Design a protein around this ligand. Structure first.
Ligand SMILES: CCCCCCCCCCCCCCCCCC(=O)OC[C@H](COP(=O)([O-])OCC[N+](C)(C)C)OC(=O)CCCCCCCCCCCCCCCCC
Ligand SMILES: CCCCCCCCCCCCCCCCCC(=O)OC[C@H](COP(=O)([O-])OCC[N+](C)(C)C)OC(=O)CCCCCCCCCCCCCCCCC
Ligand SMILES: CCCCCCCCCCCCCCCCCC(=O)OC[C@H](COP(=O)(O)OCCN)OC(=O)CCCCCCCCCCCCCCCCC
Ligand SMILES: CCCCCCCCCCCCCCCCCC(=O)OC[C@H](COP(=O)(O)OCCN)OC(=O)CCCCCCCCCCCCCCCCC
Ligand SMILES: CCCCCCCCCCCCCCCCCC(=O)OC[C@H](COP(=O)(O)OCCN)OC(=O)CCCCCCCCCCCCCCCCC
Ligand SMILES: CCCCCCCCCCCCCCCCCC(=O)OC[C@H](COP(=O)(O)OCCN)OC(=O)CCCCCCCCCCCCCCCCC
Ligand SMILES: CCCCCCCC/C=C/CCCCCCCC(=O)OC[C@H](O)COP(=O)(O)OC[C@H](N)C(=O)O
Ligand SMILES: [Cu+2]
Ligand SMILES: [Cu+2]
Ligand SMILES: [Cu+2]
Ligand SMILES: [Mg+2]
Lengths: 75, 160, 53, 35, 68, 282, 116, 59, 196, 165, 98
């Protein structure tokens, strides 16, 4: 389906209809490109956050890593 | 982009070419004193090393295998296995080999100034203001035909 | 990289810039050749446009 | 009237003079560079 | 645990020697030399006593009592 | 470590005790992470580890050429370089090192010296080493013969060549008849005399007075030299980031008794090592 | 886009890939090729002071049975035996080394044995 | 199936290994018809094996 | 029945998940194709107009995508799970792949006559539950140290030092192969590992 | 390789300019489009294979060390397999084109979603240039690269499923 | 073999371009080359291509070969390795390079 995003947003209204449709198609392609990118980036950053939490809770009272992993400074 | 942009780009490229050419020639000229000083230093080090090794070999030859006294066993420290020591350190720890190291250093320094008279000049530059103050040192090295007496050696792993 | 020689500073005066330079590359002669090819390119472009117009 | 003071490169160490005993017969016939 | 005990022994020795080094660096050379000589005294006494410790299984119960 | 004798420096004795002590039934850690191994792996964290061997080998080379292969620090570096290096490159580099390629004075690695001169110097140096090793071997054999005449030396020599490591070496020797109770008693008597000499103030004061000038000179030199060492170390520290190159920290890693790594745990602070020339052994 | 981003990330993050000898000198001073060898002052003694360029799970604790740092285990062991725990800040005895101490012991032992 | 280390002359063995002929460490787990599988491999239907596998903390 | 490692267990479970997904898809398509063929061969259900359906096409393009991101995420996590155990070791072993035999710590291992192709005269020994680092390379040509029952398969390439982390949980002998063409005796260059 | 490059250039050129009046580029039947994309695949990769083979010949003859114990056999593998997978899709796509054409001829009906099939073919062609290293997962690639190439291979898997449906 | 294969391929392309330019010179002498000649266009494009490739090769050469230190003369000042602290005969310490 892929409606014409630029009509309800009033974008590119000084171009013929065919060129406006080309721009809408490009915008829709851009939207579909960034989906999986977003999913994977979110998962990676969640993984890093969880790693920091685990290190801070395991090496909380350690003697060697009680100030880097314990504080999460350089996880 | 307009043609004016491309003319500007060509101008920048020409400026880059000019800067590269000037830097290339300046660097080629400026490293002559430093390379010469390096060559003289390695020449002196090689001569001193050979002299000390020959002295050590001669001293060892004089020791009789029939009987080794304490002095010899103390001179060469024959208690620490040879592969367990640094021979060159023995010229920086044992007093006797320390004295001979100093004497050989003086002898080699005396000899070098003969075959490399200009060495003293570099000595003035390095002593006064450190190795860094030779980047554009003027002297008798600014001559493509000037002979430094190295015979093309002590500059690289192969003859120059 | 693994190198036959030493390329760590403060052991010799010309060792830090050893691995980082391949000095035998015929520098200013290569510069002259580049100038020649630039001459050729610009002359040919100018003449091509001149004949086309 | 000034020399080239660039430090020469180090290609082949002495202990590697045999090139690890590697065959070097060029197609011309002799173990020498085309040049 | 055997390595643990060995490590504790070596660490104690190093700490004593490090205190001696600190004295060497900070206080007078005569005081440092006296400290070194007394430390060597006690260490050599320990070494000789350890050497005698090896002979204890095969020594008379009387003589073994004069130094133990 | 009950029957072990530290003083004995016999390779066979140390090998037997190494087999007894470094056995994996007791000496193998469970669920232990060694900070040394973790750091070395974290610096080179990929499957392609060609770059660690050269770095650690060069660290060890600097240590050896400056302090000698007998330094415990250089032994530690050698142990690590062996562990994290593949034996092909290691064999090639050992072959090069034998030919005095890496020598700090006339080696081609550290110097821009031509092939012929390098060969002359290397042959001269190897001849020097051969002669000194011959002399040292003769002297060591003489000292072996001479040390067997002392009472205690006899006992140590007998224990050093026992067929098996024993919890009670002297007892197992005497009950086997190889060691005589008379010799054991004589050695104990000599040691007792020396011990008693240490305790009393007269003989001590004699020794302490006989050994005070050398100690004073050493203390004076150490107190004077420490400053200059710091000055030159600071000057070198300026060279740390002058260029894109790397400045060595000779020695890279020392033997640490307060924070023991994997080397100290496996080799008992350098007691149980391979007996090869690269470890400063004959 | 994935390919382009991967190439850029490799050129930015990887320690062994350096655009030092691959770009004209005018741009070279923006490169630090040896950074991986200079991290943590170059000393290989404390992971987490050394960058580890992984996409994920760079420092993730292992599975099975969680490993205990060797120095933590030694701290517990030493405190169990009444000795002091691991210092974690003590330096080496650069001056007056073990060899010097052993030599002093050797000379006094030689004298005492000689003049027993 | 078992590895025959007693039929090989001058074979290096660890000092801390169990040399009893019928020890666990001498079994051949794979690449032999067994009738008693000791390893779970990617081609093994545990359903055909009735899920008689060891726990998670063990193994 | 034990697993012999945890990495192999993780790989096996990922494999089972993918197998379930693909079998489900195959069953769906089999039902669809059965209906289509049964209608076709009897000369039923003909429509020359049915050559386009926008909704169906969009949906059938979207569906494989959502079911594939899960597989990709699971695979990536399995890779990193394989690679985490590095750095927690206390034993190093070096392996050289020669021409039709292996070398472990400078000890040679060649095929024997007691076993046909599987057994070796000199195995490679590692301790159970003890993390070990294998430094693998080769002298002449490319081989491939392959013990796939422990989840190890790493190429031994000349001049390239690969470094894998091996861990054993089940005691016994694991048989593996060269898994890379190396010459005439490629088929007779086996690998034996003993976990004790 | 030379023969394939010549054929590919010829096919693209003929299909781009000699179409009869009234036939646009994307209205040419399915087989022509698949041949065009196959030709584009062959053009982009064969020079790399030529470089790899010249490397092998130079190593064998003039005794260089590109792929020796002091060389990069992995470099050879990278180049060869950069050619390797485009060759695979070059092999497969024309079969898709021929099957589509013949189907139009024997089922007496048009292709379901002809535009969809053409776009899927070009997608497969383009995505095949970013997956070459899934043939070297055990060589010792970086962990990030392993993950990336698994991802890219799945991406290429999608449009082929579209075509099968 | 790397640097040399680059330069040798470039030299081969330069030789072929020289042949093409010689042929174009011959045809221009005969007056057969007009202002809209595809031979002229091909020679122009080929010449521009080879010259651009040489520009990039010169950039690569001056990248690998050059270094700011080479242009800046950044030499050390200590020589840590070959510099030892020793006590002279007088008693006060000294610094010298061995
Ligand atoms: C790298 C990019 C290579 C392709 C450049 C194509 C355009 C071009 O050559 O422009 C410059 C000119 C042509 O530009 P131009 O003057 O025709 O400008 C384009 C025309 N307008 C502005 C009206 C749109 O070509 C040349 O100079 C030929 C040599 C090309 C390589 C030059 C490298 C310089 C660094
Ligand atoms: C490097 C790869 C080389 C092989 C591939 C080359 C492809 C070139 C394609 C050019 C093209 O299509 O041009 C169309 C154009 C078409 O031109 P046109 O006909 O449209 O232009 C009008 C011309 N008039 C009006 C004069 C008739 O043709 C050319 O540019 C001429 C190409 C000639 C190619 C053959 C060369 C002849 C001489 C023999 C040399 C052989 C090698 C010798 C080596 C010696 C070594 C020591
Ligand atoms: C440059 C381009 C190329 C690409 C290169 C860059 C690659 C980047 C990576 C992208 C892919 C990311 C994949 C997903 C990341 C994994 C997330 C994670 O870390 O999950 C943690 C989870 C539990 O952690 P664990 O340590 O086992 O805890 C046990 C006791 N708490 O772990 C596990 O349970 C084990 C793993 C299972 C599979 C992961 C599935 C997601 C995990 C579920 C969410 C976490 C659950 C935690 C509970 C609370 C959640 C609300
Ligand atoms: C007409 C177009 C070209 C046709 C090509 C036909 C042949 C195809 C084979 C391709 C590659 C062949 C490689 C063999 C050439 C070996 C060259 C050689 O020996 O190189 C050494 C020389 C530099 O010697 P150097 O040691 O630096 O000199 C010391 C003092 N100056 O360095 C050189 O001489 C480098 C030369 C360039 C690198 C080769 C690339 C191809 C260019 C063709 C060169 C001549 C080919 C000769 C082949 C003979 C059989 C036909
Ligand atoms: C256009 C020119 C692009 C290349 C510019 C290189 C010079 C700038 C520079 O040095 O950037 C920093 C870094 C290279 O520095 P280096 O220390 O060698 O690498 C980090 C260690 N892996 O390099 C980087 O951080 C990456 C630089 C390139 C990233 C963008 C590439 C695409 C640009 C648009 C096309
Ligand atoms: C469209 C055409 C270009 C496609 C580019 C796709 C890029 C994919 C990712 C590239 C990459 O880095 O892949 C990883 C691979 C090996 O990675 P690895 O060497 O292990 O990691 C760095 C180790 N220091 O890296 C490599 O093998 C290096 C690949 C370099 C890029 C080559 C691209 C092809 C160039 C010629 C054709 C271009 C036009 C078609
Ligand atoms: C309809 C279209 C569907 C096509 C795609 C679906 C098919 C299946 C494919 C799905 C996935 C498609 C590919 C998209 C997933 C790519 C994931 C990816 O680059 O990570 C990003 C990376 O982790 C994070 O990078 P960041 O910006 O933090 O920088 C780095 C920082 N320094 C670090 O290192 O911390
Ligand atoms: Cu093989
Ligand atoms: Cu094989
Ligand atoms: Cu493929
Ligand atoms: Mg393979």
């Amino acid at each position: 389906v892929f409606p014409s995003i630029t009509k309800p947003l009033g974008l590119f209204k000084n171009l013929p209809r065919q060129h406006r449709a080309a721009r809408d198609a490009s915008i829709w392609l851009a939207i579909l490109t960034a989906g999986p990118f977003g999913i994977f980036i979110a998962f990676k950053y969640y993984a890093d956050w969880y790693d920091k939490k685990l290190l801070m809770e395991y090496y909380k009272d350690s003697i060697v890593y009680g100030e880097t992993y314990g504080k999460g400074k350089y996880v | 982009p307009s043609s004016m942009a491309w003319t500007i780009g060509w101008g920048f490229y020409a400026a880059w070419i000019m800067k590269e050419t000037w830097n290339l020639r300046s660097s080629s000229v400026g490293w002559t004193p430093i390379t010469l000083m390096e060559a003289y230093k390695t020449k002196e080090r090689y001569l001193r090393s050979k002299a000390m090794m020959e002295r050590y070999n001669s001293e060892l030859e004089a020791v009789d295998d029939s009987n080794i006294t304490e002095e010899d066993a103390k001179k060469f420290e024959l208690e620490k296995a040879t592969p367990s020591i640094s021979i060159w350190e023995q010229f920086r720890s044992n007093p006797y080999w320390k004295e001979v190291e100093e004497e050989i250093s003086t002898d080699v320094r005396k000899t070098m100034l003969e075959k490399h008279p200009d060495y003293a000049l570099l000595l003035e530059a390095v002593k006064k203001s450190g190795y860094s103050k030779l980047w554009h040192l003027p002297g008798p090295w600014m001559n493509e035909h000037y002979n430094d007496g190295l015979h093309g050696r002590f500059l690289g792993w192969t003859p120059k | 990289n693994n190198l036959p020689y030493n390329n760590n500073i403060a052991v010799n005066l010309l060792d830090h810039l050893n691995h980082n330079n391949n000095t035998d590359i015929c520098l200013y002669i290569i510069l002259h050749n580049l100038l020649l090819l630039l001459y050729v390119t610009l002359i040919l472009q100018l003449v091509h446009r001149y004949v086309q117009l | 009237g000034m020399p080239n003071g660039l430090p020469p490169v180090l290609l082949n160490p002495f202990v590697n003079r045999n090139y690890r005993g590697q065959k070097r017969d060029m197609p011309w016939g002799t173990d020498c560079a085309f040049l | 645990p055997v390595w643990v005990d060995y490590w504790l022994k070596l660490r104690d020795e190093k700490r004593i020697q490090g205190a001696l080094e600190r004295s060497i660096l900070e206080e007078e050379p005569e005081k440092a030399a006296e400290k070194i000589l007394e430390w060597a005294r006690t260490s050599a006494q320990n070494k000789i006593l350890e050497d005698l410790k090896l002979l204890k299984p095969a020594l008379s119960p009387a003589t073994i009592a004069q130094f133990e | 470590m009950e029957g072990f004798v530290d003083k004995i420096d016999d390779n066979k004795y140390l090998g037997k005790w190494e087999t007894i002590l470094t056995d994996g039934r007791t000496h193998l850690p469970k669920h232990i992470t060694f900070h040394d191994a973790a750091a070395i792996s974290a610096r080179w964290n990929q499957q392609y580890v060609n770059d660690s061997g050269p770095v650690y080998y060069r660290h060890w080379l600097a240590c050896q050429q400056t302090y000698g292969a007998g330094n415990e620090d250089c032994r530690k570096l050698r142990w690590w370089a062996q562990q994290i290096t593949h034996p092909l490159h290691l064999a090639e580099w050992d072959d090069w090192w034998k030919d005095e390629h890496y020598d700090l004075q006339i080696g081609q690695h550290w110097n821009r010296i031509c092939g012929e001169e390098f060969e002359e110097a290397s042959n001269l140096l190897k001849d020097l080493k051969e002669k000194r090793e011959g002399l040292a071997a003769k002297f060591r054999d003489l000292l072996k013969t001479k040390t067997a005449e002392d009472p205690m030396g006899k006992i140590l020599h007998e224990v050093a060549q026992l067929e098996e490591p024993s919890k009670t070496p002297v007892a197992d020797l005497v009950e086997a008849g190889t060691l005589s109770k008379e010799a054991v008693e004589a050695a104990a008597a000599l040691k007792i005399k020396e011990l008693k000499a240490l305790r009393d103030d007269a003989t001590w004061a004699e020794v302490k007075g006989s050994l005070l000038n050398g100690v004073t000179t050493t203390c004076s030199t150490l107190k004077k030299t420490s400053k200059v060492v710091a000055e030159l170390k600071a000057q070198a520290e300026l060279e740390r980031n002058k260029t894109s190159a790397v400045k060595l920290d000779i020695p890279h890693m020392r033997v640490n008794y307060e924070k023991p790594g994997l080397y100290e745990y496996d080799t008992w602070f350098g007691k149980f090592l391979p007996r090869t020339p690269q470890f400063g052994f004959a | 886009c994935l390919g382009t981003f991967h190439i850029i990330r490799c050129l930015v993050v990887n320690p062994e890939l350096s655009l030092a000898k691959v770009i004209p000198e005018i741009l070279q001073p923006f490169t630090n090729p040896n950074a991986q060898l200079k991290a943590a002052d170059g000393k290989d003694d404390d992971d987490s002071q050394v960058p580890k360029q992984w996409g994920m799970w760079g420092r993730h604790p292992n599975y099975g049975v969680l490993h205990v740092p060797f120095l933590d285990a030694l701290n517990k062991e030493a405190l169990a035996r009444g000795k002091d725990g691991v210092n974690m800040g003590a330096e080496y005895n650069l001056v007056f080394t073990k060899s010097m101490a052993d030599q002093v012991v050797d000379l006094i032992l030689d004298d005492v044995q000689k003049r027993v | 199936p078992r590895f025959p280390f007693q039929e090989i002359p001058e074979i290096y063995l660890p000092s801390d290994i169990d040399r009893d002929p019928n020890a666990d460490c001498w079994r051949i787990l794979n690449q032999v018809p067994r009738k008693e599988k000791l390893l779970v491999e990617i081609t093994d239907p545990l359903r055909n094996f009735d899920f008689k596998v060891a726990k998670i903390k063990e193994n | 029945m034990r697993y012999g490692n945890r990495e192999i267990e993780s790989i096996i479970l990922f494999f089972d998940q993918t197998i379930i997904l693909y079998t489900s898809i195959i069953n769906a398509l089999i039902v669809g194709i059965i209906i289509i063929i049964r209608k076709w061969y009897n000369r039923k259900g003909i429509c020359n107009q049915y050559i386009y359906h926008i909704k169906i096409e969009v949906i059938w393009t979207i569906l494989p995508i959502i079911f594939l991101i899960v597989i990709v995420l699971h695979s990536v996590t399995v890779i990193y799970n394989l690679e985490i155990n590095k750095g927690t070791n206390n034993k190093y072993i070096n392996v050289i792949g020669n021409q039709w035999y292996w070398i472990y710590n400078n000890i040679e291992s060649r095929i024997s006559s007691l076993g046909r192709i599987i057994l070796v005269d000199q195995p490679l020994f590692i301790k159970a539950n003890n993390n070990t680092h294998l430094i693998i390379s080769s002298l002449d040509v490319i081989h491939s140290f392959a013990l796939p029952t422990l989840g190890i398969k790493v190429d031994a390439i000349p001049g390239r030092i690969n470094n894998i982390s091996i861990n054993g949980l089940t005691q016994g002998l694991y048989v593996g192969y060269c898994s890379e063409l190396c010459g005439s005796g490629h088929a007779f260059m086996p690998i034996n590992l003993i976990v004790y | 390789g030379i023969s394939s490059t010549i054929g590919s250039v010829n096919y693209i050129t003929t299909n781009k300019y000699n179409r009869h009046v009234g036939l646009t580029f994307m209205n040419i039947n399915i087989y022509n489009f698949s041949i065009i994309v196959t030709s584009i695949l062959l053009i982009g990769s064969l020079p790399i294979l030529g470089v790899a083979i010249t490397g092998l010949l130079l190593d064998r003859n003039i005794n260089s060390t590109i792929y020796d114990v002091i060389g990069d056999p992995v470099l050879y593998q990278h180049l060869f397999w950069f050619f390797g997978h485009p060759e695979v899709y070059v092999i497969i796509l024309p079969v898709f084109g021929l099957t589509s054409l013949i189907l139009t001829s024997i089922i007496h009906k048009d292709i379901f979603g002809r535009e969809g099939m053409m776009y899927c073919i070009i997608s497969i062609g383009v995505v095949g240039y970013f997956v070459w290293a899934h043939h070297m997962f055990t060589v010792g690639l970086d962990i990030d690269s392993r993950s990336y190439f698994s991802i890219a291979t799945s991406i290429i898997s999608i449009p082929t499923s579209v075509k099968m449906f | 073999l790397g640097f040399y294969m680059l330069l040798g391929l470039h030299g081969s392309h330069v030789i072929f371009g020289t042949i093409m330019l010689a042929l174009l010179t011959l045809w221009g002498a005969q007056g057969s080359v007009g202002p809209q000649s595809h031979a002229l266009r091909f020679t122009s494009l080929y010449v521009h291509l080879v010259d651009l490739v040489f520009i990039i090769l010169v950039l690569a050469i001056y990248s690998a070969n050059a270094s700011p230190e080479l242009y800046g003369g950044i030499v050390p000042n200590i020589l840590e390795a070959r510099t030892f602290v020793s006590v002279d005969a007088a008693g006060n310490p000294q610094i010298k390079e061995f």
